[model samples]
Target: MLPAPKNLVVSEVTEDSLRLSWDSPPNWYDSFLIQYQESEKVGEAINLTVPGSERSYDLTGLKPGTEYTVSIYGVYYVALSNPLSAEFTTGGH
Candidate 1:
């Protein structure tokens, strides 16, 4: 079984991008899911999975001065663990 991602951090914010990093669990997982959406909840949002080997992800093409809610989960062969979440706002351009 895969454990939940730990020590989630939101950093490196710019006008249009930011960095999300976390500590991986001791066991291996097949992948990680990174989900994010605007605070207003007006769109479908970006919900996608990334390779498990990566502990950090650089998110780009975001709107400046927007508050976004983000979360991450670890996926094993058949299941996804509970997510660790963070909220970030981009800087003004």
Candidate 2:
């Protein structure tokens, strides 16, 4: 079972790194899954298993000249959320 997503936001986009900020679902969760993908598919999408209270992540190893779409998923003790997403562009290739 998956909970609902809420307060999805994107914050702090850098050339090779990004800082994501978000809150848990209204139903709330006990953990999180953060993911990011490039629009061009140049690299594998990043997935992070975060703790329940974690509200942010400093994503590393971003390739330049690539576009990124970040999404946050709230994972509860017995449920998950659909993923909140945000898009940003990296620096030069």
Candidate 3:
């Protein structure tokens, strides 16, 4: 089984954007799927995919002063690993 990414970090937070990075698992993966949603359940969750070689991402166009939960999954072929998640709050205006 593929392993989840480790050491998820949220940084460079602003009113509408933030940065995320993590340590990749030892096993090979085809890509990564990122999912994030506001904690208040304002709307649908946002999903994104990045190449396996990438370990960091920048999320933009977010609501200010909101708490969000982001999850990362490693993809191998058509299978997804267990999610690695972290919580962060956008900066207040």
Candidate 4:
């Protein structure tokens, strides 16, 4: 199994957006998979795939003053590593 990404961080929080960053695993990966959703289970989770070369992403169109949970996975071929995750609350409107 591939190793999971490390040091997940949530920053740059705003009323409708936030930034996510993490350290890449030492092993190789074809891509990264990101999944996020409201912590209260208010809606379906959103999924995104980013290039392996990327280490950060900006998430927009979020609800103000809401708590969210995000997970990151290292993907290789058909395999996926265990996820790294973080929780953060958006700024109030």
Which prediction has more favorable TM-score, 2 or 3? 3
All candidates: CA RMSD in angstroms?
Answer: 13.4, 13.8, 13.4, 13.4
Off by over 4 Å in 2: 25-27, 79-93
Of models 2 and 4, which has the larger lDDT?
Answer: 4
Which lDDT values do the candidates have, in the order given? 0.83, 0.72, 0.84, 0.84
lDDT of 4: 0.84
lDDT accuracy of residue 35 in candidate 2: 74
Candidate closer to the true structure by TM-score (higher is better), 1 or 3: 3
For residues 3-77, what per-residue lDDT tens digits would candidate 1 score against the true structure?
Answer: 667998978999898898899854477688888998776478788788888888888898998888888998777
Off by over 4 Å in 1: 79-93
Q: TM-score for all predictions?
A: 0.74, 0.65, 0.76, 0.76
* Model 4 pairs whose backbones collide: none
C-alpha positional error of residue 76 in candidate 4 after TM-score superposition, expressed in Å: 0.6
Where is the poorest 10-residue window by lDDT in model 1? Answer: 24-33
Model 1: how far residue 56 lies from native, Å: 0.4
Per residue, candidate 2 scores C-alpha lDDT tens digits across 1-93 of 665556766576667877777756433667778877886654577788987767777788777667877777777564557779999999998
